[PDB]
Amino acid sequence: PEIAYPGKLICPQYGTENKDGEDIIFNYVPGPGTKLIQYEHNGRTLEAITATLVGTVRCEEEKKTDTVKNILVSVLPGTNDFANNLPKEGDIVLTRVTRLSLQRANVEILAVEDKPATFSVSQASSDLGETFRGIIRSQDVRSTDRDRVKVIECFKPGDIVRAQVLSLGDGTNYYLTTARNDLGVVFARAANGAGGLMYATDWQMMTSPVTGATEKRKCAKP
Amino acid sequence: MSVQAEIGILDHVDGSSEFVSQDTKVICSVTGPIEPKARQELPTQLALEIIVRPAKGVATTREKVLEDKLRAVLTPLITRHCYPRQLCQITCQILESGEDEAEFSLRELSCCINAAFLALVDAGIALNSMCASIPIAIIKDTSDIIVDPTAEQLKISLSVHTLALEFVNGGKVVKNVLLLDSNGDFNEDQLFSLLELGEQKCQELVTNIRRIIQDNISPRLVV
Amino acid sequence: ETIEIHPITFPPEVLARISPELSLQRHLSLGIRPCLRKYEEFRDVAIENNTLSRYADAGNIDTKNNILGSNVLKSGKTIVITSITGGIIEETEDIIANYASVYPVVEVERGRVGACTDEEMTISQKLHDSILHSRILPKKALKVKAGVRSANEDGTFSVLYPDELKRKWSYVLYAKIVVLSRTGPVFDLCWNSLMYALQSVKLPRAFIDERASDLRMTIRTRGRSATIRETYEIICDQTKSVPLMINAKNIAFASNYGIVELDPECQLQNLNTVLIADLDTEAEETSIHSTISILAAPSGNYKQLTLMGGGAKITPEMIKRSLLLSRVRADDLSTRFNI
Amino acid sequence: DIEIHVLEQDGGIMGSLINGITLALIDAGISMFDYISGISVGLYDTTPLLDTNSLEENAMSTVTLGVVGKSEKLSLLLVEDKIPLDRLENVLAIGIAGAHRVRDLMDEELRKHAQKRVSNAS
Amino acid sequence: GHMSLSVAEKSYLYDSLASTPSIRPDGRLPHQFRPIEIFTDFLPSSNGSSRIIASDGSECIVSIKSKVVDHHVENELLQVDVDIAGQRDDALVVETITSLLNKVLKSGSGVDSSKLQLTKKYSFKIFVDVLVISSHSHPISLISFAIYSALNSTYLPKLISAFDDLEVEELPTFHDYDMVKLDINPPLVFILAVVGNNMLLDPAANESEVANNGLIISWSNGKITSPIRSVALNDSNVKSFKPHLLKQGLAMVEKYAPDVVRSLENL
Amino acid sequence: QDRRRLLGPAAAKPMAFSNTESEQELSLHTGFIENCNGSALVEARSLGHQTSLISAVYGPRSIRGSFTSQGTISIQLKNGLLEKYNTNELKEVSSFLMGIFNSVVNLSRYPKSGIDIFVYLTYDKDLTNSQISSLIPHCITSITLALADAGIELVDMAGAGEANGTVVSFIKNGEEIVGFWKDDGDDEDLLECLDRCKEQYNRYRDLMISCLMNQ
Amino acid sequence: LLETISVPQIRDVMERFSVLCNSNITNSSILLGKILPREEHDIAYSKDGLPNKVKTEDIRIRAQNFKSALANLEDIIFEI
Amino acid sequence: MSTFIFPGDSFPVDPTTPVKLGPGIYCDPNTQEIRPVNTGVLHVSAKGKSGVQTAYIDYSSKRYIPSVNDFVIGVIIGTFSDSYKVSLQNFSSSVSLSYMAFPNASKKNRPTLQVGDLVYARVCTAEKELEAEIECFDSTTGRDAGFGILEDGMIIDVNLNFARQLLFNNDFPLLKVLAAHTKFEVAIGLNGKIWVKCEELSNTLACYRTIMECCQKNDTAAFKDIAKRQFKEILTV
Amino acid sequence: SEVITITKRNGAFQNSSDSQIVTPGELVTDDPIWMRGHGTYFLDNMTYSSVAGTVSRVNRLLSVIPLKGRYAPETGDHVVGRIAEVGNKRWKVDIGGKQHAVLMLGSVNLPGGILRRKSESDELQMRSFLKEGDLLNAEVQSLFQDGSASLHTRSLKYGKLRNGMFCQVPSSLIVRAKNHTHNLPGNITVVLGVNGYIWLRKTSQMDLARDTSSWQIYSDENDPSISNNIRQAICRYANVIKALAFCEIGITQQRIVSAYEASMVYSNVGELIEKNVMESIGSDILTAEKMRG
């Protein structure tokens, strides 16, 4: 698989070989960048893995602890883009708080996280509402005492909040959560950007070196 | 520099004014802070809605430039972080050009800056400092720098200038130059001679404005 | 309460998206800018003149083309395409009343659909005004020297043009400026492109039929009669053309500058006013509020200047340094492409 | 939402628009207090002309009247051309009387449509 | 599309339609149209008019007006104007159908423009105004039937003055009462639906929602003619189709169109 | 005249001028517009007609209007500098292009997202000392390049060809058809057009893959 | 479970795929080809006012250095 | 005669003295400097006030900005789960009034108020970047509440200065001049709203006309005499 | 063989026991004792109608029953609706009234039924259980102040619909009854919503057990094995319902089966959409009813 382009055939749905007097069955699974497409040829139909992206073809297989070998066929970019890595349920994202009212905290997705880090950045404009907007409900702010949560003491306008996707929600708002130790306000300035840089000293407290003023926030565990 | 202004002339607006220089008369109104449209909302700062209406005809792209330059002056003047997710409507209705509008927009812009500032003062909106704007022009045969030129002087000018300075400390310290809009043929020496004489007449204007503001507002307040 | 805390650091692309202001200050602490340039480094410029014009091949003049002059300009990552078309209208010192201008329509593509943005509308005005203010196009340079087409012997048509000497016509210049791949303040690129385009404009010869049959049109009132004056159809020559008379002494070139204060709490290990040349990237357009825009003529004349101080104070030193660089930039742009 | 399509026009289009909406609204079973009948009246010289067409409207001033039910109360009084102040009251009187006839015709046709439906349904 | 259906309803409909013996939800055959009603000559103000009513309540009104023009300066002698109620004039569907219809009824493509000529200089410009009151699917074929009916019952003013401008140059004058019937051959536009390997004439609303693709095929002078356009009836289930399907569609229209025209050209 | 543009004086009148098989070669470039996610430059020169068009893909971005399991695609053609086409005709091609790429773009991978594709008909010169039919295959080439450059998943490299007013777009090595267009032309010439267009489709697809890889 | 599909049946799949796969098996700029895809260059004016092309190489070197400076730079901070 | 100040002027008080900042005075988050941002009369409280001096600027304004512990007159305009949507002033951002806070409050128990009702309410919390909250009963009130519906009467628009003087200044003759003619109740809101009711409409109308005239002239002397002409004109019929 | 039926007409735009009737503004009575209900309005003693319909007198309650109008929800109605939108912890469903009905997350039987513990997660993930476009059975649990309906599906009888096809008739042609789900010959089952929304599906085991798996009560999947006859039966039944509706005659379980067997005269099914067959069919239904008396 030297090269990948949209529409190029990769492999059949199944494969096999002969090793040590035993036939090994390869079960190929359509991964990210590929798709099972049914073609016709010689009169008989055929389903084959087809690349849907432009890049280098990669495969992975795995058995975990919690004859047929399952192989995952995928296509990665060859050469940054927030296209192929659109925010899905379970993904962690970096978003900026746009507005606060008592009911909920609202942020617009700026970037997305990946497993061992690296980041994906949305090229959309925050000036034209081109960015995917999301909502952090008051009961999804933290894990303990979700009934009595003051939004004003958890987030502030302009704060950069690292959150995880709960659901796609509607077309307007994603639904996010920060009820983990590594989630919450990550980057912030005092007085909504009118002050100096604040770092997360305590998990619930933010401190600034020149300002001499401390503002409470639901910060990620340092 | 014999300008004349009135403050608080409109009833259904938070603040208003009427600035007059020569034949150039501009009336301005300011409402805010108020609830903003979703597309206007700024998470941390105040949103400015700036509108300029011409003396004749409807608003064109010309006034769109007047709105843009007026924005560059009013934006740093207002303490915007005091009003997050809020709106301030600023409308200027030019009543009389005082100049050939087909050729110049100098006097109308300066008068709009002074009027908008006065309207912001009347409305009681947080301002970081004070401000004054004057129109300046240069004549090729004369070689002179005329502050507050007439319409007839503009017709025979080689360059036209709008100068708006930011004043602090009782109108004695020039904090910054908010706007300098120089158009036409001019050299570096003319520019600084313009800025030197321009700063003087601007400082005189602030002093006059401070007088007008106190004369109108003080009767409203209590001792 | 003495404590030690460790910051969490985000990739430069991430940091630029998260906090443009911080991304700017981080770069400035290492003597560079978010666009990987140094404080006083400009973007290079590459142009191609008259490539879209009808007259681009003098040997093979296009017949189905109405472009009088054109310029394709790319500076850094931003692309500007300018084309000049024309029209004709009947007409009936160094003062501004004796100068004309072009009527530009600048369109910026950003993946949206709808009405004209405030950006596009304002870009057109400043271009129109600065052409009139810098006195590039005198009205005399647009006067149509109309010829006469008669039917000579052997059944042929010939056109006789006057030279160096009744109805009078004038040329009208229009401009379409398409801006692709916007990355920041784009006025300066539109102006420089327009200047290059104007220096390639060729005005088509115009003529009228010797004795067109169409004469006055009688219109009757309630008893009295009146005659509408005979309208002569002016026609442009398919091939012959004259170059546009531009006051080359007045052609200025555009450049912009910014001033920032270095924030001590943003330095990287390894007071002062900073002059930054040719603003690009979101980070610079968003966080730098003290800016300077100059149209400087190679003669060293300045067509226009703009001082917007919303951030750092504009000191005389910052102004002088900007004026110096504007001259140096203008000298480069004017002589580079031998237009 | 009320959508109207004017397929053909020949004077008194405003009055016809009023009658069309009143009928359609009733057909939709939407509650209303009373009928609103529309009519136009021209004034050629002294004379008053009920229900004028395009030719008459081009040759004289017309008055468009909307009358609520059988009453003397006007929902719409529309005068777009010059009318002597002395003639206006009489013109109104003609229009109101004519509009009442329009109401009767609308009411008649409506009961007819109703009655048949009742007969066939029950 | 217009109609909203659940995933289950779509799956049932698709399987039913994609079956080798294609089963339509109303029991129709792959070439059977639904009953329509057509009214003509009800607009005396116009030269011609029609009104078509479908079985699903879809309604379209066509008007035909004429104007004397100089055919030396007026290239297009037949202008189609489409107005779909509830849609902007600059809507995507409106302009597309407008552009399409104008090509279907071009002066020198699918219309005998000779019958519009008055003199050596002047000719009759025909304005075909379309008004779609209601529609639940692609109304292109609905409008086509109405335009056909309207153009076959159109009456134009008769010329009196001489027909040689070049020399005598007489001003175009017409008779006070007599009108000559517009003899012309209006083309028809058929729309097909592609569900699996089956092709259906006159796709219903629910049918179009599950269709894989669609075809717009024009018809004039007893033969297939341009414009021919493939069209996505919906946008959620659009798939590529084998070339034989395209040839099947053209063949299907080629044999069932005269039947439609026969029922439409009734005296 | 217009209060949003400078169109000049109204008494002015535009300047009007007076009088006194073939092989095709194209040039391809991608990713030169930083403003968007994907872009392409397609230039073709043949006989007495050359065309230079630019495509730009913006997406996947946020959709206000409705919830969606799959993605939504919009295509808009814009007139260029000199050559002009009817807005209706540009809308019609846009609709024809939407149908094609709704069969190619893997919409399932982009829930509640919008992919807005712009094609600028920048420079279309007519040098002959419905012309829109000859531009259609070049549009599909540009959009395919731009989408692939953007990183939008495609089932297959969609290409097309034109022959005597007939335009047909192919996928899957020309086995199937994703779009069929026919204006004017002749009668019973379907088979000849399909073969000629498939030849252009094959040539365009090879150059596209060559561009997406080597460049 | 997977006993149902044969190795032999799958083998045929490899064959038909090889059949399908086997069966499947210069640029010049006319007008805007030259200027539109122009590589980004930068210039730096010296004291004499002469334009100097920044090295294509230079841009990369600063970027590597900038990346280094932040990563090493980020770690240490004391608050009192 | 007073000591007027303008934005960008030097602040008289020295940093060596602890100063509580009120309206008009701004503390820059970046440069830590204290500077005036409003135009008017500077008022500085005398020393000895628990070691803390309060400095503020009295400036002319009519656009209300919610601050904690303010008595305001709102109009119900909306229904939201868990509270009322109430508007202090036209075109201003809405404020919230919880169902929980009422004179004989119960979580089960609910308010009978219907959109369009006037409420005499106290603004307990006013976050700058968050919707204003208005409560009828306050903990500060400590079991005494004047809060609730205003029935009938007439409401009057008034600039913030005139309303502040009417609520906190006892030397303001307006209430007295209106008491020497008729007896009626009045609610005063710091958001520039004044509610007036009498037994007869003619008296309420007369009060309405007086308050507007007195608010317009701002001449303290005028009202007793100005009021006299107003009372007379009503009986003119 | 006939390609199409076109009906033509020229020179015209369009073709052209006693029950009390009244129009808006008409005086119904002058007895002030009456309690004025819907369709009326009053001034002192005079009571006027607020719509075009028949005067109704029940006890002392004078009201005017309108001729025309949308389906009006009553508490306890069996309706068929389509999910219009999903927000918060509720489902908004299109019934066919003035407003969308609401369907709170609480009412519906969640997967695993009673045994599963109540979950915070489900509110976020509800779209998966239900989404825009889905059809379902529901009962009008309660009514809002304006008249809007709150729905519930807290039953095995109610839930997501599948294995069939949708069609709708005017709500006036379907009245309230003891039960709206009926079994018909051809192994198909009809669901006659009071709102006029009708669902025709293949008879399931539940439909049989009504007169004689809890994890898959919201699955979109149609039954894998659905015979053509069942499909061709559905098409036939659906057409006859449209035929009954075309006659403006209210549907009956008996009328449907009667029409279904009577329609067997016609070989091809696609021959049930034509008006003549409907007109003749309608008369057939009605004459029999008259005979029954």
Swiss-Prot record, chain A:
GO molecular function: RNA binding
UniProt cross-references to CDD domains, sorted A to Z: S1_CSL4
Primary localization class, coarse: cytoplasm
Top-rank taxon: Eukaryota
Disulfide-bond pairs as recorded: none
Single Gene Ontology BP annotation: nuclear-transcribed mRNA catabolic process, non-stop decay
InterPro entries linked: Csl4 (IPR039771), CSL4_N (IPR048626), EXOSC1_C (IPR019495), NA-bd_OB-fold (IPR012340)
Cellular component GO terms, alphabetical: cytoplasm; cytoplasmic exosome (RNase complex); exosome (RNase complex); nuclear exosome (RNase complex); nucleolus; nucleus
Protein localization: Cytoplasm; Nucleus, Nucleolus
Annotated keywords: Cytoplasm, Exosome, Nucleus, Phosphoprotein, RNA-binding, rRNA processing
Other comments on record: Present with 5550 molecules/cell in log phase SD medium.
Function per UniProt: Non-catalytic component of the RNA exosome complex which has 3'->5' exoribonuclease activity and participates in a multitude of cellular RNA processing and degradation events. In the nucleus, the RNA exosome complex is involved in proper maturation of stable RNA species such as rRNA, snRNA and snoRNA, in the elimination of RNA processing by-products and non-coding 'pervasive' transcripts, such as antisense RNA species and cryptic unstable transcripts (CUTs), and of mRNAs with processing defects, thereby limiting or excluding their export to the cytoplasm.
Designated name of the protein: Exosome complex component CSL4
Species of origin: Saccharomyces cerevisiae (strain ATCC 204508 / S288c)
Curated annotation (Swiss-Prot), chain B:
Lineage, uppermost ranks: Eukaryota, Fungi, Dikarya, Ascomycota, Saccharomycotina
A GO molecular-function descriptor: RNA binding
Pfam families: RNase_PH, RNase_PH_C
Residues annotated as transmembrane: none
Keywords: Cytoplasm, Exosome, Nucleus, RNA-binding, rRNA processing
Cellular-component GO terms for this entry: cytoplasmic exosome (RNase complex); exosome (RNase complex); nuclear exosome (RNase complex); nucleolus; nucleus
Note: Present with 10800 molecules/cell in log phase SD medium.
GO biological process: exonucleolytic trimming to generate mature 3'-end of 5.8S rRNA from tricistronic rRNA transcript (SSU-rRNA, 5.8S rRNA, LSU-rRNA); nuclear mRNA surveillance; nuclear polyadenylation-dependent mRNA catabolic process; nuclear polyadenylation-dependent rRNA catabolic process; poly(A)-dependent snoRNA 3'-end processing; RNA catabolic process; RNA processing; rRNA catabolic process
Gene it is expressed from: RRP46
Name by which UniProt lists this protein: Exosome complex component RRP46
Swiss-Prot record, chain F:
Domain of life assignment: Eukaryota
Pfam families linked to this entry: RNase_PH
Location in the cell: Cytoplasm; Nucleus, Nucleolus
Alphabetized GO MF terms: RNA binding
Keyword rRNA processing attached: yes
Function field: Non-catalytic component of the RNA exosome complex which has 3'->5' exoribonuclease activity and participates in a multitude of cellular RNA processing and degradation events. In the nucleus, the RNA exosome complex is involved in proper maturation of stable RNA species such as rRNA, snRNA and snoRNA, in the elimination of RNA processing by-products and non-coding 'pervasive' transcripts, such as antisense RNA species and cryptic unstable transcripts (CUTs), and of mRNAs with processing defects, thereby limiting or excluding their export to the cytoplasm.
Family: Belongs to the RNase PH family.
Protein name: Exosome complex component MTR3
Source species: Saccharomyces cerevisiae (strain ATCC 204508 / S288c)
Gene: MTR3
Swiss-Prot record, chain H:
GO molecular function: manganese ion binding; RNA binding
Single GO biological process annotation from the record: RNA processing
Pfam family, one: Rrp40_N
Entry GO terms, CC: cytoplasmic exosome (RNase complex); exosome (RNase complex); nuclear exosome (RNase complex); nucleolus; nucleus
Domain of life: Eukaryota
Location(s), subcellular: Cytoplasm; Nucleus, Nucleolus
Swiss-Prot/TrEMBL keywords: Cytoplasm, Exosome, Nucleus, RNA-binding, rRNA processing
S1 motif domain sequence ranges: 67-137
Keyword Transmembrane: no
Reported function: Non-catalytic component of the RNA exosome complex which has 3'->5' exoribonuclease activity and participates in a multitude of cellular RNA processing and degradation events. In the nucleus, the RNA exosome complex is involved in proper maturation of stable RNA species such as rRNA, snRNA and snoRNA, in the elimination of RNA processing by-products and non-coding 'pervasive' transcripts, such as antisense RNA species and cryptic unstable transcripts (CUTs), and of mRNAs with processing defects, thereby limiting or excluding their export to the cytoplasm.
PANTHER family registered for this protein in UniProt: EXOSOME COMPLEX COMPONENT RRP40 (PTHR21321:SF1), PNAS-3 RELATED (PTHR21321)
Family: Belongs to the RRP40 family.
Additional detail: Present with 6050 molecules/cell in log phase SD medium.
Name of this protein: Exosome complex component RRP40
Gene source species: Saccharomyces cerevisiae (strain ATCC 204508 / S288c) (Baker's yeast)
High-level lineage: Eukaryota, Fungi, Dikarya, Ascomycota, Saccharomycotina
Gene from which this protein is expressed: RRP40
